[PDB]
Amino acid sequence: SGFRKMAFPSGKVEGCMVQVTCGTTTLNGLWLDDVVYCPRHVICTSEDMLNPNYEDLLIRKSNHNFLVQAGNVQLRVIGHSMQNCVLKLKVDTANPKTPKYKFVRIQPGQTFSVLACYNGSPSGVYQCAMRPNFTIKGSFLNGSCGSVGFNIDYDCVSFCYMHHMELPTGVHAGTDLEGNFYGPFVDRQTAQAAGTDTTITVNVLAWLYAAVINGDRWFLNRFTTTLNDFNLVAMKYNYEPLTQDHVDILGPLSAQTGIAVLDMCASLKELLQNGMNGRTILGSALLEDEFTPFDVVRQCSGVTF
Amino acid sequence: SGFRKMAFPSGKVEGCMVQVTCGTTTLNGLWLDDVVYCPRHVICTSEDMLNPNYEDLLIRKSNHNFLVQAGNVQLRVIGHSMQNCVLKLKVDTANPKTPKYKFVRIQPGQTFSVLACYNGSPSGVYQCAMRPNFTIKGSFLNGSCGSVGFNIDYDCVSFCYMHHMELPTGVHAGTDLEGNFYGPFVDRQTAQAAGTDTTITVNVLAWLYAAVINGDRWFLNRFTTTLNDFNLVAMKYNYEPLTQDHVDILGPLSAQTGIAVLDMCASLKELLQNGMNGRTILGSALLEDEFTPFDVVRQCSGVTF
Ligand SMILES: CN(CCO)S(=O)(=O)N1Cc2ccc(Cl)cc2[C@H](C(=O)Nc2cncc3ccccc23)C1
Ligand SMILES: CN(CCO)S(=O)(=O)N1Cc2ccc(Cl)cc2[C@H](C(=O)Nc2cncc3ccccc23)C1
Numbered sequence: 001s002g003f004r005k006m007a008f009p010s011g012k013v014e015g016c017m018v019q020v021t022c023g024t025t026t027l028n029g030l031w032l033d034d035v036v037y038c039p040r041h042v043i044c045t046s047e048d049m050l051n052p053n054y055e056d057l058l059i060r061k062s063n064h065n066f067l068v069q070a071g072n073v074q075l076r077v078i079g080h081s082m083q084n085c086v087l088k089l090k091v092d093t094a095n096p097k098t099p100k101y102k103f104v105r106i107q108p109g110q111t112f113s114v115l116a117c118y119n120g121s122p123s124g125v126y127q128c129a130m131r132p133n134f135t136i137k138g139s140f141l142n143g144s145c146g147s148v149g150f151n152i153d154y155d156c157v158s159f160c161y162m163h164h165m166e167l168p169t170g171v172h173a174g175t176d177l178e179g180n181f182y183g184p185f186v187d188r189q190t191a192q193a194a195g196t197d198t199t200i201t202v203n204v205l206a207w208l209y210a211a212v213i214n215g216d217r218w219f220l221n222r223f224t225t226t227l228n229d230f231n232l233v234a235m236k237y238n239y240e241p242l243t244q245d246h247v248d249i250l251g252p253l254s255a256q257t258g259i260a261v262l263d264m265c266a267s268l269k270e271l272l273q274n275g276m277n278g279r280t281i282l283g284s285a286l287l288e289d290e291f292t293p294f295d296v297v298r299q300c301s302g303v304t305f
Numbered sequence: 306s307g308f309r310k311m312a313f314p315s316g317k318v319e320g321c322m323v324q325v326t327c328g329t330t331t332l333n334g335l336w337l338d339d340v341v342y343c344p345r346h347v348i349c350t351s352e353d354m355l356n357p358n359y360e361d362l363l364i365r366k367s368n369h370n371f372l373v374q375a376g377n378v379q380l381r382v383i384g385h386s387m388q389n390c391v392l393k394l395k396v397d398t399a400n401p402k403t404p405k406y407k408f409v410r411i412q413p414g415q416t417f418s419v420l421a422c423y424n425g426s427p428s429g430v431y432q433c434a435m436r437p438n439f440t441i442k443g444s445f446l447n448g449s450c451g452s453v454g455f456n457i458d459y460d461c462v463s464f465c466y467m468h469h470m471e472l473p474t475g476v477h478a479g480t481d482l483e484g485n486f487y488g489p490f491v492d493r494q495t496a497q498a499a500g501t502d503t504t505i506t507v508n509v510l511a512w513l514y515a516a517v518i519n520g521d522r523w524f525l526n527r528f529t530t531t532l533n534d535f536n537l538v539a540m541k542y543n544y545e546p547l548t549q550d551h552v553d554i555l556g557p558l559s560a561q562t563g564i565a566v567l568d569m570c571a572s573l574k575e576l577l578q579n580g581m582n583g584r585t586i587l588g589s590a591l592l593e594d595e596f597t598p599f600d601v602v603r604q605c606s607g608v609t610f
């Protein structure tokens with residue numbers, strides 16, 4: 001019993017964190033085999049950020065301009081290249097702690113664990129989701145650039161995010177491990193703003209099924225809805241449209257609890273209309289959207305209370 | 306910017322988790338040097354659990370009855386002893402991944418990270434608090450027994466909790482690493498219930514200071530209060546009494562924000578008597594009490610391990 005915002009154990013990722021320094025800038029890097037991956041803005045000054053020409057800044061650098069530190073050991077840089085917004089530093093030593101891994105690009109609504117780091121040293125781990133507007137609501141301070149997001153399903157680490165910047169509203173933007181940004185953002189200090197955010201509907205539904213599994217049904221009703229009528233109502237509360245893919249993905253949770261997806265959609269419509277009236281759902285007074293259908297199946301029991 | 310329920314990096318603890326099997330029962334153990342620590346109820350069958358005489362059950366066991374697995378390697382048990390509600394299994398191999406550590410007993414209101422495990426394999430990490438009623442609101446399924454709670458101070462892991470059981474309300478009970486239970490609980494199948502719980506006042510205040518540090522100031526007011534008047538109000542809303550020690554501990558956060566502790570107490574008094582009126586604080590519609598004053602300072606300063 002119980003339901004917590006749970007992160008993956010961070011050990012496999014802690015053994016990859018390093019400190020990268022270029023001149024006066026210091027940030028984090030990910031050391032996998034003989035390559036260290038880090039944001040390419042490590043080569044910029046604060047002035048350069050307005051309109052940086054990364055190719056022009058990088059051509060003026062040599063391998064020995066990059067200082068890489070792993071614990072108390074200085075690694076030697078033997079090569080360097082840029083791939084999109086990521087800098088790849090070839091080092092002379094393969095990381096002996098390299099786990100089994102993949103680079104995966106996630107879609108909005110997907111969740112992941114963040115190992116926040118400063119000076120190549122891990123400070124904390126938390127769980128979060130890729131918002132529909134492609135930002136993440138993280139907890140990051142200056143020096144956290146290069147911190148990574150990941151999932152560890154089975155024994156393989158799937159790296160999906162690398163931290164690059166904080167937007168004016170306090171939310172965060174970054175790239176996959178191939179250097180492609182999530183969202184219409186650029187590693188440049190320009191007037192960039194997060195688009196209007198929405199609630200991840202498929203995740204709220206999954207969390208309502210988790211509450212049913214744990215033994216709570218106060219929010220259910222005798223009604224159903226069509227998918228079109230649900231979406232017409234949902235978009236009035238800034239909820240993402242629910243697609244047929246989302247309905248399909250919720251199938252196993254629907255069969256385990258005995259409540260059809262469109263039946264759960266009717267409970268959601270009513271919760272949006274009435275509020276909670278002093279009640280909570282899994283210890284929360286708001287509708288939670290940072291648990292995917294997959295996270296619910298992973299954390300909850302296979303036997304409904 | 307941002308404020309998340311953040312756990313300590315779990316790597317130093319992951320390298321200590323092992324699987325302990327006695328007859329038909331399988332649970333988790335903590336392998337530190339040449340000793341494996343686990344709940345003593347691993348020796349009980351379903352009937353034995355009703356009225357167990359643990360010394361009598363243990364005397365009938367030999368070292369070879371305990372099967373200990375570290376990854377894919379079988380550890381050889383060479384001795385066994387009981388200390389309170391913890392079983393200590395002497396093994397033939399010292400854990401080469403043993404971190405610098407201490408066994409510490411925490412007080413209600415203090416927080417810690419939980420590395421939830423099944424079959425000696427870590428599955429997730431989350432942050433939680435020792436409730437005033439000595440239970441923890443964890444997320445555990447069958448097979449979680451032996452999972453541990455910890456904090457990290459510089460490079461030293463302080464083990465403070467070992468999971469033993471789930472109470473009928475879905476909350477959890479366990480011991481320190483010396484086998485002494487937190488709360489009036491016993492390790493057996495009998496009628497047991499969590500007492501009436503209260504809100505950790507010093508933690509809610511710390512979280513209000515964190516919200517101010519993050520730009521959420523709508524709840525601040527021109528008013529102040531005496532410590533006695535605040536406690537008279539706090540007792541009415543099932544809040545723990547605020548002591549002069551709590552006021553002293555909040556001093557640094559009060560100096561950083563320019564808001565005196567009794568000034569913040571006046572904001573809390575108004576939130577308790579009026580509610581939030583449709584507003585949220587750090588994305589929450591409830592007053593959060595699972596962040597200590599030290600957690601707020603560490604997260605808003607970037608302390609690493
Ligand atoms: C936020 N800044 C603008 C304020 O006038 S800044 O600190 O100068 N800034 C500008 C900037 C621009 C583009 C890119 Cl790709 C990176 C950066 C840097 C940046 O975003 N780093 C930070 C990352 N995450 C959390 C951060 C919390 C706090 C501070 C800084 C953070 C550095
Ligand atoms: C009555 N049981 C479940 C309580 O809700 S039980 O499964 O028979 N139960 C009896 C029992 C008695 C004393 C002691 Cl010290 C431990 C236990 C065991 C126990 O508490 N283990 C569990 C721990 N955490 C989450 C658990 C979720 C589900 C099941 C079991 C869990 C085993």
Ligand SMILES: [Cl-]
Pocket residue numbers: 105106107110
């Ligand atoms: Cl995805």
